[PDB]
Amino acid sequence: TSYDVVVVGAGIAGLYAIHRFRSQGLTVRAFEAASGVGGVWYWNRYPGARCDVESIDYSYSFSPELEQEWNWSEKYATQPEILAYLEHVADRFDLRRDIRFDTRVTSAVLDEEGLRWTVRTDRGDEVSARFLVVAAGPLSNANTPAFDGLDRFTGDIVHTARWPHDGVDFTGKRVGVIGTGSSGIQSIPIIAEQAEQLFVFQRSANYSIPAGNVPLDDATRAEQKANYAERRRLSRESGGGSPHRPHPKSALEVSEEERRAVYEERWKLGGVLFSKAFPDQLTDPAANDTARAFWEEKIRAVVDDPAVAELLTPKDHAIGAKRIVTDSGYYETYNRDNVELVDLRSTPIVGMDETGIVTTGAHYDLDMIVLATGFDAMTGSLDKLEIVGRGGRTLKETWAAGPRTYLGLGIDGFPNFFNLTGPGSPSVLANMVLHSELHVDWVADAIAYLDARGAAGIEGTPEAVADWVEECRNRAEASLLNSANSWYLGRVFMPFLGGFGVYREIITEVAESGYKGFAILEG
Numbered sequence: 001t002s003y004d005v006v007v008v009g010a011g012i013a014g015l016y017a018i019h020r021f022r023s024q025g026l027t028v029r030a031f032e033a034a035s036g037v038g039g040v041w042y043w044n045r046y047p048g049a050r051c052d053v054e055s056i057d058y059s060y061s062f063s064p065e066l067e068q069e070w071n072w073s074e075k076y077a078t079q080p081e082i083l084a085y086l087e088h089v090a091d092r093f094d095l096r097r098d099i100r101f102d103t104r105v106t107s108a109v110l111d112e113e114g115l116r117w118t119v120r121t122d123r124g125d126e127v128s129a130r131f132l133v134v135a136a137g138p139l140s141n142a143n144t145p146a147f148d149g150l151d152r153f154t155g156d157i158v159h160t161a162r163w164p165h166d167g168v169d170f171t172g173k174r175v176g177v178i179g180t181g182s183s184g185i186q187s188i189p190i191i192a193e194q195a196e197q198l199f200v201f202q203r204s205a206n207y208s209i210p211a212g213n214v215p216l217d218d219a220t221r222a223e224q225k226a227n228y229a230e231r232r233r234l235s236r237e238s239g240g241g242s243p244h245r246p247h248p249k250s251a252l253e254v255s256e257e258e259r260r261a262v263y264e265e266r267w268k269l270g271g272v273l274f275s276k277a278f279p280d281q282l283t284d285p286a287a288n289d290t291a292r293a294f295w296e297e298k299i300r301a302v303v304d305d306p307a308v309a310e311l312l313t314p315k316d317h318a319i320g321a322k323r324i325v326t327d328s329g330y331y332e333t334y335n336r337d338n339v340e341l342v343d344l345r346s347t348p349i350v351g352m353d354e355t356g357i358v359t360t361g362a363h364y365d366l367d368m369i370v371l372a373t374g375f376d377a378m379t380g381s382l383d384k385l386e387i388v389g390r391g392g393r394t395l396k397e398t399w400a401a402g403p404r405t406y407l408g409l410g411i412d413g414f415p416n417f418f419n420l421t422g423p424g425s426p427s428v429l430a431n432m433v434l435h436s437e438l439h440v441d442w443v444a445d446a447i448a449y450l451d452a453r454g455a456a457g458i459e460g461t462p463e464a465v466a467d468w469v470e471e472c473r474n475r476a477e478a479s480l481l482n483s484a485n486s487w488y489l490g491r492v493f494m495p496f497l498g499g500f501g502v503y504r505e506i507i508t509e510v511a512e513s514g515y516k517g518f519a520i521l522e523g
C-alpha cells in the first residue's frame with residue numbers, strides 16, 4: 001500500500017502520467033471516479049460532443065508509433081473516436097492494471113516528517129505516496145439548476161453530463177433543451193434531425209464558429225503524418241499549442257479588404273483559432289469589434305429569420321472572451337420548421353409540471369427535457385478534494401483569496417504535490433494533450449532530479465509564488481479574457497496568459513537551473 005506516485009484521474013493527463021512515471025522506474029497507483037479511462041471523453045458523451053482543436057494536434061506526441069499508426073477519421077474527432085483512441089492508448093501501454101476505477105479520491109494528507117502523502121478513497125483505499133499528482137481535469141459539471149416541479153414532470157429528463165450509453169430516441173418526441181453553451185450547441189442540431197419538435201430555451205446567446213468538418217482522406221493523412229515532427233515543434237513553441245500564428249500586422253493596421261480575407265480564412269479552418277486571427281484580437285477592444293462584426297454578418301446570412309438571427313446574437317460581449325464554441329450546422333438548425341428559439345429574458349422558466357415547461361408567457365408540452373448543463377469553475381475538481389498540507393493547512397484555505405502557485409506546479413506548504421494543467425499554468429488556454437505532456441514530463445524530471453540528489457522533496461517557496469501570482473496578474477490585465485464575469489476568474493484570473501511556448505521555456509529553464517524558486521528538501 002505504498003507507491004512512488006499516486007495519480008488522481010485517468011483521462012489524457014493521468015494516462016500519460018502512468019506511462020511516463022513507470023518508464024522511469026517509479027511505481028504508480030492511479031484512481032479514477034469513472035468506470036473506464038478517458039476522463040471528459042469517457043463521461044461527457046451526449047450526441048455531437050467534439051473537440052475544438054484539430055485532432056492531429058489534439059493527440060499525443062510522446063509515441064512516434066501511435067502517431068503513424070492511428071488514423072483520425074476527420075478534422076475534429078467526436079467523443080466516441082477520442083474515447084476509442086484513449087482506450088487504445090491504455091491497451092498499448094498496459095495502463096489499466098495500475099488504475100482502480102469507480103474509486104473517488106476524497107483526501108490527501110501530508111506527513112511532514114516523512115514527506116509522504118496518505119491518500120484515501122470512498123472505496124476504503126488508504127495508500128502512501130512520495131509524490132501526489134492531481135490530474136483531475138479543468139472541467140467538472142455544474143449542478144443541475146433547481147427547477148421547481150421538475151420532480152413532477154412525467155416525460156424523460158436527460159442530462160448532457162450523464163448521457164445514456166445506449167442513446168436516446170428523439171423520434172416522435174417534443175423536446176426542450178435548456179442551456180446554450182457547448183453541450184447545447186453541439187447536441188441541438190442532432191436533436192433537431194430526429195425530433196418531432198424542438199424548443200431551445202435560451203437565456204444568453206454565445207459565440208459559435210463552424211467546425212467545417214471534412215473526412216480526412218488517405219493522401220492527406222500520409223502527408224500530414226510525414227511532416228508530424230515539424231508540426232509538433234511549431235506547436236510546442238506557439239501561443240496555443242497548435243502550428244498556427246496570428247497575422248504579422250495588427251487588425252487595425254491592415255486594410256478593410258485584407259481584414260475580411262484573414263477572417264474568412266480562419267472561419268474555414270474554424271474553431272478556437274478564429275479568436276486569435278489577429279495579434280491584438282483579444283487585446284484591443286476596437287480590433288475585437290471588427291471580429292464581432294464579421295461574425296454577426298456570417299450569422300445574419302445563414303439565419304433566414306432576421307429576428308431569430310438577432311436573438312442568436314450575443315449582446316455587448318467581446319468575441320472570444322468566453323471561449324468560442326465550435327459547431328456543426330448549429331445556426332442552420334434554426335431555419336427548420338420544427339425548431340423554435342425561446343427567449344428566456346422575455347419569458348423565463350418558472351417551473352415544470354406533469355406535461356412540460358412553464359414560462360411566464362406560455363406553457364410548453366414536452367415529452368423530453370434535455371438539461372444542457374455547463375461546467376463548474378476551473379478549480380471544481382480540486383475543491384471536492386480535502387488536501388491537507390503543512391500545519392494541517394488545507395488547499396481550499398490557501399486558495400481562499402485566489403489560487404496561489406509557482407508556475408502552477410509549486411505551492412508553499414504543499415511539498416511533493418503537483419496539480420496538472422490548472423491555475424498558474426496556461427491550462428485551457430492551450431492544447432491540453434501537449435500541455436499534459438509538458439507537465440507530466442516536468443514532474444518526472446523533477447522526481448529524477450531529486451532521486452539523483454538523494455533528496456526527499458520539492459516545494460514552492462512563498463517568495464516565488466507571490467512573484468508568479470503578480471506575473472499572472474500582469475499578463476491578465478491587458479486581456480479581454482479578464483472580463484467582469486469571466487469563467488477564467490476566481491479577483492484572480494487563473495490561467496497564465498503569456499503563451500504556451502513562453503511558459504514551456506520559463507518552466508524548462510527553472511528546471512535547468514536547479515529549480516530556482518523551489519526548495520529542495522532532504523527530509
Ligand SMILES: Cc1cc2nc3c(=O)[nH]c(=O)nc-3n(C[C@H](O)[C@H](O)[C@H](O)COP(=O)(O)OP(=O)(O)OC[C@H]3O[C@@H](n4cnc5c(N)ncnc54)[C@H](O)[C@@H]3O)c2cc1C
Nearest residue numbers: 009011012013033039040051052053104105136137431432
Ligand atoms: C466538448 C469538449 C470539447 C473539448 N475540446 C477540447 C480541445 O479541442 N482541446 C483541448 O485542449 N481541450 C478540450 N476540452 C477540454 C478537456 O476538458 C481537456 O482537454 C481534457 O479534459 C484534459 O484531460 P485531463 O486528463 O486533464 O482531464 P479529464 O479529461 O477531466 O480527466 C480527469 C479525470 O479525473 C477524474 N477525477 C476527478 N477528480 C477525481 C477524484 N477525486 N478521484 C478520482 N478521480 C477523479 C475525472 O473523473 C476524470 O475522469 C474539451 C472539453 C469538452 C467538454
Ligand SMILES: NC(=O)c1ccc[n+]([C@@H]2O[C@H](COP(=O)([O-])OP(=O)(O)OC[C@H]3O[C@@H](n4cnc5c(N)ncnc54)[C@H](OP(=O)(O)O)[C@@H]3O)[C@@H](O)[C@H]2O)c1
Nearest residue numbers: 052145179180181182203204322323372373374375428487
Ligand atoms: N474546449 C474547452 O476547453 C472548453 C469546453 C467547454 C467549456 N469550456 C470553458 O468552460 C466555461 C463554461 O462553459 P459552459 O459551456 O459550461 O458554460 P455556459 O456557456 O454558461 O453553458 C451553460 C448554459 O446553460 C444555461 N443555464 C444555466 N443555468 C440556467 C438556468 N437556471 N436557466 C436557464 N439556463 C441556464 C446558461 O445560460 P447563462 O449563460 O445565461 O447562465 C448557458 O447557456 C467556458 O467559459 C469555457 O472557458 C472550455
